[PDB]
RNA sequence: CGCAAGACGGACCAGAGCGAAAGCAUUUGCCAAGAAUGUUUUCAUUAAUCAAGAACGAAAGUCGGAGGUUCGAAGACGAUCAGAUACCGUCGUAGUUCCGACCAUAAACGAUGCCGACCGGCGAUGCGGCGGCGUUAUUCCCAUGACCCGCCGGGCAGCUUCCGGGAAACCAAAGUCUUUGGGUUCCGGGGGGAGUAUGGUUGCAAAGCUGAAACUUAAAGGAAUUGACGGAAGGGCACCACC
């Protein structure tokens, strides 16, 4: 008979301060009672949100995962948990008569956050191309994948998780793959399709607070 | 308004967002709706909970009646914007959504409910789980 | 009949022939 | 809230439809924004060149 | 045990070599009685795993 | 006798092709022998889009499509009326039906 | 939200590639192997096809050890039926997966032996190589990548043709055949009985290879034509159809 939502209470989930829209949305949870505390009921929770509302004037076909780590009263803060593309984009990306390229790498950033990377790429037909299809020889696919592997690992090593996300929202890393792999085979839509998180180093609160603060 | 304590402290201009997991497969239709996380569900209705005919569970008639009950429950609570997550049976089974996907979507729109991004979350495999048909298939 | 069911029926007929012959 | 009433003049008719000939298509305009015209699906005899009422401008129209 | 006599075994005895009672025995059976399959959750050819 | 030069399949230089299962009856057919349908239909029932756009939180929001590749056996295919029996001279033609653009 | 397990590698994926066939599709590395191309390199007839003999051989099946997620013979049940030992539904053993050892069968098909020569045309495609306006990548130029126009060789094919052939369907091979002979294996002789019996041999078994006769029958078959029909599609028509 008792309405559970009378027992529940609403928090607000806040993205990292490096994001211009800090407000993600509002969630609900039961009030802290018994051995249950709304603190640890709130941590370990994900909030998928499209990049269009995360930034001001960027595309909508990219989404982020945003695991929650603390509760600050009404505030319950989150950080980057994983990025992916809208499946409608992905299925529209694939097409016949051109070869899709896939690669992955598992790299450790300088702060102890190790990431699993997924990148996709497709070959372009030229403006004057008259052959119906545009394929790549197997060895070409190897070497464009090998270079897309090494620039992906080289960029994460030199920098940290803070500097990896700021340059990830524009997906400017995808622009410098095709800017240098064009000389070996012209690709036209290359994106990092997915990123997945595997380990969280020691839960350093000072690093989380300061990225969420000044 | 006021409700009172149910639903968060909101202003006039802004709105609160939810997600509707619309599982409109064949043989049934689900218009589940949850919070933005996905796990603290608010109102769960299915086509079968309304039609008593045991065969119209995926019919369009069952589809919008279930959705409006979710729709009516949303305004009772306070949730007013909804991202929509379509999904079919998926897996090794069929990928096209059933006949109740559209009728339930129409009901939300005619119930005056803001709709955000629309995505389909049909579980697609990487060529796994050999399909239950046998070699010669369903020879009906 | 289907030929393959003829081939199957005759195979099971030969098996019965071999059993009786081994008996005798 | 609801758009008020409007009137529509019918230009050349684009044949019957509805799979039994119950409805026809008319390609009407609003005699005020006479440049902007839409195709409409109506039932009954047309009188190509007459005027007909309209509540909502852009409802729908499918191609035959 | 079926080849023994009723003194040496619960299964012993009889004009035909047979158990004469379920070979599954309860776990709390007294020592001297729990012979055969002890507290068996199932019997048979064990097909499937 | 031989109804078609190729035997109903696009197999010319290889020995074996992977069997794939019909999406309607779940019968496995060779991949080259299947009837492929690529539907790029919208998930919105275009007859009922205006309210969705009217009820959208955003104004210039682009509606998403639905891209599903669809496989049939020829037993299910002609039953579903996706392919049809044709005359002998018309049967040996591989140009797809027109897109009906105008 | 995680977790664990075992299978399977979608969409890219094509009348595209590779392999003697069976067959082969996530990334990376290692191991040996192969065609084609290029060669004013080498040997100099070393070659073609091949009884006996040998290597490999889908799936199912067998034996031993792991694993058993999904499907699923057998089996159970619910339906359907007049009946329903089936189709459909829910379970579900063997099996499906891996390792090792057997079997050697498929519509194992291109229902088309291999090597060689000749006999029309056209547009493509994959690989290699040889050229050419130009675009492009970056660069500071050249190669080199991607594209365009050709070409040479080897492949998978396709379109067309009164080359010719064929019973025709059709085939640029199934042509160069009464104007009958390039070389060389296998193999058929009306339909059944019958791939049966028996003998031999292989196999753990299932079964494999070799393989008749008695007797019975006037046809059985192949390609095309017409009609009839269809619980096959498509246009048209009708207030004894509808609106
Ligand atoms: Mg049928
Ligand atoms: Mg005794
Ligand atoms: Mg006793
Ligand atoms: Mg006894
Ligand atoms: Mg007794
Ligand atoms: Mg095998
Ligand atoms: Mg099952
Ligand atoms: Mg086994
Ligand atoms: Mg074969
Ligand atoms: Mg010869
Ligand atoms: Mg004979
Ligand atoms: Zn089918």
Swiss-Prot record, chain B:
Pfam families: Ribosomal_S11. Gene3D superfamilies: Ribosomal protein S11 (3.30.420.80). It is found in: Cytoplasm; Nucleus, Nucleolus. Residues 120-140 are annotated as: Disordered. The modification Phosphothreonine is found at residue 122. The keyword Phosphoprotein applies. The keyword Nucleus applies. Residues 131-140 have a biased composition (Basic residues). There is a cross-link at residues 50, 52, 95 (Glycyl lysine isopeptide (Lys-Gly) (interchain with G-Cter in SUMO2)). Keywords: Cytoplasm, Isopeptide bond, Nucleus, Phosphoprotein, Ribonucleoprotein, Ribosomal protein, Ubl conjugation. It comes from the Eukaryota. One of its GO terms (biological process) is negative regulation of transcription by RNA polymerase II. The modification Phosphoserine is found at residues 5, 128. One of its GO terms (molecular function) is RNA binding. PROSITE patterns: RIBOSOMAL_S11. Component of the small ribosomal subunit. Part of the small subunit (SSU) processome, composed of more than 70 proteins and the RNA chaperone small nucleolar RNA (snoRNA) U3. NCBIfam families: PRK09607.1 (NF007176). Belongs to the universal ribosomal protein uS11 family. This is Small ribosomal subunit protein uS11.
UniProtKB/Swiss-Prot annotation, chain D:
One of its GO terms (cellular component) is small-subunit processome. SUPFAM superfamilies: Nucleic acid-binding proteins. Keywords: Acetylation, Cytoplasm, Diamond-Blackfan anemia, Endoplasmic reticulum, Nucleus, Phosphoprotein, Ribonucleoprotein, Ribosomal protein. Gene3D superfamilies: Nucleic acid-binding proteins. Disulfide bonds: none annotated. One of its GO terms (molecular function) is RNA binding. CDD domains: S1_S28E. The modification Phosphoserine is found at residue 37. The keyword Transmembrane does not apply. PROSITE patterns: RIBOSOMAL_S28E (PS00961). It holds the Pfam family Ribosomal_S28e. The keyword Ribonucleoprotein applies. Its main location: cytoplasm. It is found in: Cytoplasm, Cytosol; Cytoplasm; Rough endoplasmic reticulum; Nucleus, Nucleolus. GO terms for biological process: cytoplasmic translation; maturation of SSU-rRNA; ribosomal small subunit assembly; ribosomal small subunit biogenesis; ribosome biogenesis; rRNA processing; translation. It comes from the Eukaryota. Component of the 40S small ribosomal subunit. Part of the small subunit (SSU) processome, composed of more than 70 proteins and the RNA chaperone small nucleolar RNA (snoRNA) U3. Belongs to the eukaryotic ribosomal protein eS28 family. HAMAP family: Ribosomal_eS28 (MF_00292). This is Small ribosomal subunit protein eS28. It comes from Homo sapiens (Human). The gene is RPS28.
UniProtKB/Swiss-Prot annotation, chain E:
It is found in: Cytoplasm. Hydroxylated on His-16 by RIOX1. The modification is impaired by hypoxia. It comes from the Eukaryota. This protein can be partially incorporated into E.coli polysomes in vivo, indicating it can replace the endogenous protein. Component of the large ribosomal subunit. Interacts with CRY1. Belongs to the universal ribosomal protein uL2 family. This is Large ribosomal subunit protein uL2. It comes from Homo sapiens. The gene is RPL8. The chain holds residues 201 to 249 of 257 of the full protein.
Swiss-Prot record, chain F:
The modification Phosphoserine is found at residue 53. One of its GO terms (biological process) is cytoplasmic translation. Keywords: Cytoplasm, Diamond-Blackfan anemia, Disease variant, Endoplasmic reticulum, Phosphoprotein, Ribonucleoprotein, Ribosomal protein. Residues 86-96 have a biased composition (Basic and acidic residues). GO terms for molecular function: cadherin binding; mRNA binding; RNA binding; structural constituent of ribosome. The keyword Membrane does not apply. InterPro entries: Ribosomal_eS26 (IPR000892), Ribosomal_eS26_CS (IPR047864), Ribosomal_eS26_sf (IPR038551). Residues 84-102 are annotated as: Disordered. It is found in: Cytoplasm, Cytosol; Cytoplasm; Rough endoplasmic reticulum. It comes from the Eukaryota. Its main location: cytoplasm. Signal peptide: none annotated. Pfam families: Ribosomal_S26e (PF01283). PANTHER family: 40S RIBOSOMAL PROTEIN S26, SMALL RIBOSOMAL SUBUNIT PROTEIN ES26-RELATED. Belongs to the eukaryotic ribosomal protein eS26 family. It is linked to Diamond-Blackfan anemia 10: A form of Diamond-Blackfan anemia, a congenital non-regenerative hypoplastic anemia that usually presents early in infancy. Diamond-Blackfan anemia is characterized by a moderate to severe macrocytic anemia, erythroblastopenia, and an increased risk of malignancy. 30 to 40% of Diamond-Blackfan anemia patients present with short stature and congenital anomalies, the most frequent being craniofacial (Pierre-Robin syndrome and cleft palate), thumb and urogenital anomalies. Component of the small ribosomal subunit. The ribosome is a large ribonucleoprotein complex responsible for the synthesis of proteins in the cell. This is Small ribosomal subunit protein eS26.
């Amino acid at each position: 008979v008792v309405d559970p939502f009378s027992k529940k209470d609403w928090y607000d989930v806040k993205a990292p301060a490096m994001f211009n829209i800090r407000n993600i949305g509002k969630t609900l949870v039961t009030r802290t009672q018994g051995t249950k505390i709304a603190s640890d009921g709130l941590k370990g929770r994900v909030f998928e949100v499209s990049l269009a509302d995360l930034q001001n004037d960027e595309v909508a076909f990219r989404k982020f995962k945003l695991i929650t780590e603390d509760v600050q009263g009404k505030n319950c803060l989150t950080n980057f948990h994983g990025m992916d593309l809208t499946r409608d984009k992905m299925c529209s990306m694939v097409k016949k008569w051109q070869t899709m390229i896939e690669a992955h790498v598992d790299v450790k950033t300088t702060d102890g956050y190790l990431l699993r990377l997924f990148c996709v790429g497709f070959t372009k037909k030229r403006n004057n191309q008259i052959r119906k299809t545009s394929y790549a020889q197997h060895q070409q696919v190897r070497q464009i994948r090998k270079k897309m592997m090494e620039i992906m690992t080289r960029e994460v090593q030199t920098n940290d998780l803070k500097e990896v996300v700021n340059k990830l929202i524009p997906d400017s890393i995808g622009k410098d793959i095709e800017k240098a792999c064009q000389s070996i085979y012209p690709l036209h839509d290359v994106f990092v399709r997915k990123v997945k998180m595997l380990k969280k180093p020691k839960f350093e609160l000072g690093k989380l607070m300061e990225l969420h603060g000044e | 308004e006021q409700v009172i304590s149910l639903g968060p402290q909101v202003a006039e201009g802004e709105n609160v967002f939810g997600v509707c997991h619309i599982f409109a497969s064949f043989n049934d239709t689900f218009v589940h709706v949850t919070d933005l996380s996905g796990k603290e569900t608010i109102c769960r209705v299915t086509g079968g909970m309304k039609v008593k005919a045991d065969r119209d569970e995926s019919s369009p008639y069952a589809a919008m009646l279930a959705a409006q009950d979710v729709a009516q429950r949303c305004k009772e609570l306070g949730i007013t914007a909804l991202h929509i997550k379509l999904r079919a049976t998926g897996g090794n089974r069929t990928k096209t959504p059933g006949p109740g996907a559209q009728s339930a979507l129409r009901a939300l729109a005619r119930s005056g409910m803001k709709i955000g991004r629309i995505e389909d979350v049909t579980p697609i495999p990487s060529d796994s789980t050999r399909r239950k048909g046998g070699r010669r298939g369903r020879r009906l | 009949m289907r030929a393959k069911w003829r081939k199957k029926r005759m195979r099971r007929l030969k098996r019965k022939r071999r059993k009786m012959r081994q008996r005798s | 809230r609801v758009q008020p009433i409007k009137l529509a003049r019918v230009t050349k008719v684009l044949g019957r439809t509805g799979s039994q000939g119950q409805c026809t298509q008319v390609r009407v305009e609003f005699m005020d924004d006479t440049s902007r015209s839409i195709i409409r699906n109506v039932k009954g005899p047309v009188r190509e060149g007459d005027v007909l009422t309209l509540l909502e401008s852009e409802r729908e129209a499918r191609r035959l | 045990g079926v080849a023994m006599n009723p003194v040496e075994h619960p299964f012993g005895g009889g004009n035909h070599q047979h158990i004469g009672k379920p070979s599954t025995i309860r776990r709390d059976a007294p020592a001297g009685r729990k012979v055969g399959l002890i507290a068996a959750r199932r019997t048979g050819r064990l097909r499937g795993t | 006798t031989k109804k078609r030069r190729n035997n109903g399949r696009a197999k010319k230089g290889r020995g074996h092709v992977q069997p794939i299962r019909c999406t309607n009856c779940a019968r496995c057919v060779p991949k080259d022998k299947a009837i492929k349908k690529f539907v790029i239909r919208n998930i919105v029932e275009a007859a009922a889009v205006r309210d969705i756009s009217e009820a959208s939180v955003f104004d210039a929001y682009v509606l998403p499509k639905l891209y599903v590749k669809l496989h049939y056996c020829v037993s299910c295919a002609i039953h579903s009326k996706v392919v049809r029996n044709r005359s002998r001279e018309a049967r040996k033609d591989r140009t797809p039906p027109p897109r009906f653009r105008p």
